[PDB]
């Protein structure tokens, strides 16, 4: 059947720029069907374009997008911030329906350092023969960052457990969590575990650790 | 008065069946056509089924065919979708959608449903685990204090943590779970003011509905251990 | 149901030019050609 | 109802199809019969 | 989806005016006649309005003629009902009706609305106050113990009291309210066991929309009036 | 225009009892145009009876009410015990709606004492000047009930609030509360007061009283 296309699959900016999508078609296909759609986070999607170039209802002034033959677009002109989410593009066949693959926006702050707090493991998994030592970074831009785990400054990297955050509409940072999980007797093998956090906004990896003061 | 609602969905064996429907309400149902898309995890869209309104034309891609069934009801005013002999790459996000123009097939979709997860895999289900977290110490005890809650070893998806009946939600980070060796693993972080704990008490809330799990933990500050 | 020019517009015509925007071109031309048919074929027996 | 030609298509016939497949049958003969008929007693009229 | 809810309605001075509405939805608007019914406060019903489906045609009492407004708007899909130089027989239930056969004016009635209160008097907006009960003593003080929650001294009509939010729900009576000298006064009892109550501590609670007033009130377990 | 009048208005009846209403009219009307509504506690009422012999959806089978010419009548077979409510009987008239007044029916049980239970005022309303003494009578069969304020033997009838209760669905008996209002110099000219309550069901009438015991 038809197959479609997108470029770029990621892509940033701020209020104040202008922004331009593709859907790239691989065979010659008239203008009548066609369709757009937006998805926010967990959120069933919803029409936005009817027909390649005429707007839907509750739509604002600013979209628009146009063409013809093999090529097509959307343009956004004064792009708010509401306007960091996913979007598709549809093409109708002989009997199939085709979507797009996924085109996502993302919204630009300023940078910071990550903030760091680690946590020990509780008593009642300790009774259970485990451990699991857990590292959160939170309130972070961008979403590009690198952790380590050192135990008496061994670098280990078995047994981490990691997983990021939809960007936030509150400040547009990223948050994180890095778990490293243990058993009963090699938590008491050893003194120090410490987690660092490396990231573009300070050459020194900060570093937020625990001993075994009372543990 | 536009609505569409789902029903169905859970966990099924590879090897059997599963037979959702679709509840439709607000426009005249018989003077449309009906279908089904779905939505894979890894973020992108694929077309299952549809059928015109009066219900004896049906379509199908050719990667699913002969398989699944779907027919329609007028009087009931609901749509039905019935699967059989399943396989793993079916775990993904389903939906329910009307077409534009009226009597037609195959243009445009304008009003979906909202979702129903199915996911057929070989695991186990199990009950999760909750543990309640503190800090070890502070230098100069700031008032930027921190507490987390730790759900591990479940099956299957969803779970539903919330912060004394849902009391707060500022300030709070959800985290997506992510699955190792058959078992789910959920973390959650919350940063309160150093003089609202420990005088206000708070409680995680986990509340697990394909188990059955209705496990509820509270944070101790930092008991040492030590023994005379 | 064309013929009898029962619904041709209301049902038939209209939700259809709604998608082919020149589908008036092949229904408009088919209500002249049978209906002349039927006037003729009413004059036949009238001139029998 | 059927005789007079008025929504004979969209109000009685094609809901009985969607129960009945065959129904059709029995109501298009019916319009070569009446019709038929009806223009014959016209001409009656013309040779008076 | 048929569904008919109300708004408007409150006080209103006599020499005033009100405008009523009345929102339909699930049926088709364009298709029916539509009908205001009232009910009296002791226990009688009595007809106001009502109109065909395209707006042209009124039908009208002799006892109220010339005063009330109806009217229609189909693109909107509500009902109105304006009215000027209100009495005071006028302090009643209103409702809003569909007629049963279509295109119909004047036969039966099969859906209706819920209500929606107005009342037309000279009195005055008040705050009421509240005032927690408990008993004096008790002989053998056995397991059987009640309080009470005394409301008085308010306006208009109505008042919501709950029990800690609406926790408890057995074993209270709700007393209608009786209106002297321009002042509504509401009481309330409960009855719990003799074990829960003092150990237990509970609020009357109180929510006065009318005025704006929320008092929230505890029972003090019979303290005695002495003093050194 | 046409009047409506009924009979009775107040009957009451047990599970196991048959019974039958009457509307009767002022009058001659052809039967095409009579309906029947039914209201429960708070409900706004609902259609009942289309045509004066055919039902509604939502319907047992055991609710039927025939005739013709000028009188017309509603029985029930086998009567539970969830048709204690109020009833209404409509007619078309030129261009008029004209119901009736209301046929209100009661569940009866066993008889019983009333629970009595006074309460005294409480502080705060004795820093405001007044006083108010409640007494309470709760879960009562039947309605009828007398009541009195007794003040050193003295029988005040000055300052009395009653209101009655619905028919409770729990049990099939009926609340009351009686308030003596008072002013603050009133309340201390005196010592003892009584509420008592006067039935059928005990030629004695129980006395609930207070004094002023640290008061």
């Known amino acids: 059947e038809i197959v479609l296309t997108q470029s770029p699959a990621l892509m940033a900016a701020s209020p104040g720029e202008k922004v331009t999508i593709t859907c790239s078609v691989s065979?010659?296909?008239?203008?009548?069907?066609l369709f757009w759609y937006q998805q926010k986070s967990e959120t069933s999607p919803k029409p936005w374009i009817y027909?390649?170039?005429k707007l839907a209802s509750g739509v604002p002034v600013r979209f628009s997008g146009s063409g013809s033959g093999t090529s097509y677009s959307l343009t956004i002109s004064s792009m708010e911030a509401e306007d960091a989410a996913t979007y598709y593009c549809?093409?109708?066949?002989?009997?199939?329906?085709?979507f797009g693959g996924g085109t996502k926006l993302e919204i630009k702050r300023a940078d910071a350092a990550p903030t760091v707090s680690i946590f020990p493991p509780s008593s009642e998994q300790l009774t259970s023969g485990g451990a699991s030592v857990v590292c959160f970074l939170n309130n972070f831009y961008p979403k590009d960052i690198n952790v380590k785990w050192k135990i008496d400054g061994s670098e280990r990297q078995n047994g981490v457990l990691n997983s990021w955050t939809d960007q936030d509409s509150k400040d547009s940072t990223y948050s994180m969590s890095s778990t490293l999980t243990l058993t009963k007797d090699e938590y008491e093998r050893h003194n120090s575990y410490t987690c660092e956090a490396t990231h573009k906004t300070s050459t020194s990896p900060i570093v937020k650790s625990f001993n075994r003061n009372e543990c | 008065e536009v609505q569409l609602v789902e029903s169905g969905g859970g966990l099924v064996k590879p090897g059997g069946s599963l037979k959702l429907s679709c509840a439709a309400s607000?426009?005249?149902?018989?003077?449309?056509?009906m279908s089904w898309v779905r939505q894979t995890p890894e973020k992108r869209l694929e077309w299952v089924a549809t059928?015109?309104?009066?219900?004896?034309?049906?379509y199908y891609p050719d990667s699913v065919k002969g398989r699944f069934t779907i027919s329609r009801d007028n009087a009931k005013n609901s749509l039905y979708l019935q699967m059989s002999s399943l396989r793993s790459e079916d775990t993904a996000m389903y939906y329910c959608?009307?077409?534009?123009?009226?009597?037609?097939?195959?243009?445009?979709?304008?009003?979906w449903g909202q979702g129903t997860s199915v996911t057929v895999s070989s695991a186990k289900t199990t009950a999760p685990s909750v543990y309640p977290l503190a800090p070890v110490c502070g230098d100069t005890t700031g008032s930027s204090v921190t507490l987390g809650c730790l759900v591990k070893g479940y099956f299957p998806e969803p779970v539903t943590l919330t912060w004394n009946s849902g009391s707060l939600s500022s300030g709070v980070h959800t985290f997506p779970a992510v699955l190792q060796s058959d078992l789910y693993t959920l973390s959650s972080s919350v940063t309160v003011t150093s003089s609202t704990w420990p005088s206000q008490s708070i409680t995680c809330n986990v509340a697990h509905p394909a188990s059955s799990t209705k496990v509820d933990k509270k944070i101790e500050p930092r008991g040492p251990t030590i023994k005379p | 149901q064309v013929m009898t020019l029962e619904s041709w517009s209301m049902g038939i015509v209209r939700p259809l030019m709604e998608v082919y925007p020149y589908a008036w071109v092949f229904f408009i031309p088919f209500i002249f050609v049978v209906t002349f048919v039927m006037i003729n074929l009413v004059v036949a027996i009238c001139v029998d | 109802q059927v005789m007079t030609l008025e929504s004979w298509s969209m109000g009685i016939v094609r809901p009985l199809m969607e129960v009945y497949p065959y129904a059709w049958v029995f109501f298009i003969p019916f319009i070569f019969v009446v019709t038929f008929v009806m223009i014959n007693l016209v001409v009656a009229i013309c040779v008076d | 989806e048929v569904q008919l809810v109300e708004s408007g309605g409150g006080l209103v001075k006599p020499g005033g005016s009100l405008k009523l509405s009345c929102?339909?939805?699930?049926?088709?608007?364009?298709?029916?006649?539509?009908?205001?019914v009232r009910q009296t406060p002791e226990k009688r019903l009595e007809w106001?309005?009502?109109?065909?489906?395209?707006?042209?045609?009124?039908?009208?009492?002799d006892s109220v003629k010339g005063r009330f407004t109806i009217s229609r708007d189909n693109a909107k899909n509500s009902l109105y009902l304006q009215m000027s130089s209100l009495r005071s027989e006028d302090t009643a239930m209103?409702?809003?009706?569909?007629?049963?056969?279509?295109?119909?004016?004047?036969?039966?009635?099969?859906?209706?609305?819920?209500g929606t209160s107005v009342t037309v008097s000279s009195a005055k907006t008040t705050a009421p106050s509240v005032y927690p009960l408990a008993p004096v003593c008790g002989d053998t003080t056995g397991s059987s113990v009640t309080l009470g929650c005394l409301v008085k001294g308010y306006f208009p009509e109505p008042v919501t009291l709950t029990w800690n939010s609406g926790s408890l729900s057995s074993g209270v009576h709700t007393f209608p309210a009786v209106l002297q000298s321009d002042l509504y006064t509401l009481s309330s009892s409960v009855t719990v066991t003799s074990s829960t109550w003092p150990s237990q501590s509970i609020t009357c609670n109180v929510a006065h929309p009318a005025s704006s007033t929320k008092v929230d009130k505890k029972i003090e377990p019979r303290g005695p009036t002495i003093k050194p | 225009e046409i009047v409506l009048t009924q009979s009775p208005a107040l009957m009451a009846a047990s599970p196991g009892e048959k019974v039958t209403i009457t509307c009767?009219?002022?009058?001659?009307?052809?039967?095409?145009?009579?309906?029947?509504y039914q209201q429960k506690s708070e409900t706004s009422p609902k259609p009942?009876?289309?045509?004066?012999?055919?039902?509604?959806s939502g319907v047992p089978v055991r609710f039927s009410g025939s005739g013709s010419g000028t009188s017309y009548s509603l029985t029930i077979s086998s009567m539970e015990a969830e048709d204690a409510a109020t009833?209404?009987?409509?007619?078309?008239?030129?261009?008029?709606?004209?119901?009736?007044?209301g046929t209100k029916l009661e569940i009866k049980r066993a008889d019983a004492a009333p629970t009595v239970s006074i309460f005294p005022p409480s502080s705060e309303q004795l820093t405001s000047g007044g006083a108010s003494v409640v007494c309470f009578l709760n879960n009562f069969y039947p309605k009828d009930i007398n009541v009195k304020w007794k003040i050193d033997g003295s029988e005040r009838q000055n300052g009395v609030l009653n209101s009655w209760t619905d028919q409770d669905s729990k049990d099939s008996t009926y609340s009351m509360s009686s308030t003596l209002t008072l002013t603050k110099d009133e309340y201390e000219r005196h010592n003892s007061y009584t509420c008592e309550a006067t039935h059928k069901t005990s030629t004695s009438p129980i006395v609930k009283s207070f004094n002023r015991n640290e008061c």
């Open positions: 549809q093409q109708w066949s002989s009997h199939s329906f085709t």
């Open positions: 059928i015109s309104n009066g219900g004896r034309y049906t």
């Open positions: 959608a009307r077409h534009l123009y009226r009597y037609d097939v195959g243009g445009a979709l304008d009003y």
């Open positions: 027909g390649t170039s």
């Open positions: 607000g426009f005249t149902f018989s003077n449309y056509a």
């Open positions: 065979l010659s296909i008239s203008s009548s069907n």
